Amino acid sequence: GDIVSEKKPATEVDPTHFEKRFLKRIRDLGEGHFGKVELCRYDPEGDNTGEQVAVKSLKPHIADLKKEIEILRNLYHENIVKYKGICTEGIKLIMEFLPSGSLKEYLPKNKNKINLKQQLKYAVQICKGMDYLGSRQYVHRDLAARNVLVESEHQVKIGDFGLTKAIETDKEYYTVKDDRDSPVFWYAPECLMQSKFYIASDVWSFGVTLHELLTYCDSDSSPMALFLKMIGPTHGQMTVTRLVNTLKEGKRLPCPPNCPDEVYQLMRKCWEFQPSNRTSFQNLIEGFEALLK
Numbered sequence: 001g002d003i004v005s006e007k008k009p010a011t012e013v014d015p016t017h018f019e020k021r022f023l024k025r026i027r028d029l030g031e032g033h034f035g036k037v038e039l040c041r042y043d044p045e046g047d048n049t050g051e052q053v054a055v056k057s058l059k060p061h062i063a064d065l066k067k068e069i070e071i072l073r074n075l076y077h078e079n080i081v082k083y084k085g086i087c088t089e090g091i092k093l094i095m096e097f098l099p100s101g102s103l104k105e106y107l108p109k110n111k112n113k114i115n116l117k118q119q120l121k122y123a124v125q126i127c128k129g130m131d132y133l134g135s136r137q138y139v140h141r142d143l144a145a146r147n148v149l150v151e152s153e154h155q156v157k158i159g160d161f162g163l164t165k166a167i168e169t170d171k172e173y174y175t176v177k178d179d180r181d182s183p184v185f186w187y188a189p190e191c192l193m194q195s196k197f198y199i200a201s202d203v204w205s206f207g208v209t210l211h212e213l214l215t216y217c218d219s220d221s222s223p224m225a226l227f228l229k230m231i232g233p234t235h236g237q238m239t240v241t242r243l244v245n246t247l248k249e250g251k252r253l254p255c256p257p258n259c260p261d262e263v264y265q266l267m268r269k270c271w272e273f274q275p276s277n278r279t280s281f282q283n284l285i286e287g288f289e290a291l292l293k
């Protein structure tokens with residue numbers, strides 16, 4: 001008889017499925033280690049009215065990006081950047097686009113608008129996001145101002161999860177294997193020395209991130225600039241060991257200009273050499289809130 005074909009089942013629309021053919025690249029936002037993020041417009045109507053979105057893709061580790069996507073897809077918190085969907089055949093992660101960019105872009109341009117009180121409020125928000133992440137048994141491993149996005153003058157969000165790892169149930173840390181592109185000047189001693197990563201290691205990084213926030217992310221005051229001034233900028237492959245030794249002696253980043261001692265002491269509690277001696281995110285929140293009232 002007639003050409004037998006297949007009966008077509010009724011098509012549903014998945015709002016988390018972005019078709020490659022409507023995803024139009026505008027410009028680069030940043031580079032991770034495994035990958036890069038681009039500003040696109042998703043423009044199915046083809047008239048430049050579609051929503052702007054941030055698109056993470058691999059540099060030509062698919063497994064790692066898929067893991068990152070599954071982590072982010074299931075995080076729900078006002079201080080964590082929103083997952084929007086994926087674009088598949090390879091895969092791309094689609095996230096909300098925050099036009100103000102990271103604290104690295106925003107702070108230098110808005111010093112006059114952002115005073116100590118607003119800085120402490122951002123600090124509380126970063127801790128709340130991080131505490132949420134820790135409650136889900138994750139270690140972030142890349143907490144720095146460049147990964148903290150500005151939603152508005154009043155709100156920030158943790159905006160990248162490229163290095164985030166699950167801590168095994170009943171275990172206390174994650175053991176790192178690939179460490180070549182580590183942000184060593186944000187890293188706690190146990191991370192540097194033994195490649196172990198605790199929730200307390202993220203508390204250490206938070207301290208460094210707070211330092212950046214308090215210096216308005218100026219490049220001449222960045223943790224790297226300041227540490228290389230402390231240990232020497234010409235040690236090449238001995239840099240990390242020199243860093244470890246400086247930290248062993250008790251040396252830390254100095255108090256930022258105009259930063260009250262009481263804020264600097266909260267920062268120093270993040271940098272206890274021993275993980276078990278460091279403050280917690282919940283204690284930091286309490287400390288900041290007390291300074292705000």
Ligand SMILES: C[C@@H](O)c1nc2cnc3[nH]ccc3c2n1[C@H]1CC[C@H](C#N)CC1
Pocket residue numbers: 029030031032033037054081095096097098099100101102105146147149159160162
């Ligand atoms: C300008 C740059 O800091 C930036 N602007 C963004 C706006 N919306 C975004 N949504 C997701 C990321 C993202 C953004 N990123 C960076 C943040 C850090 C990321 C990394 N690693 C690269 C893109």
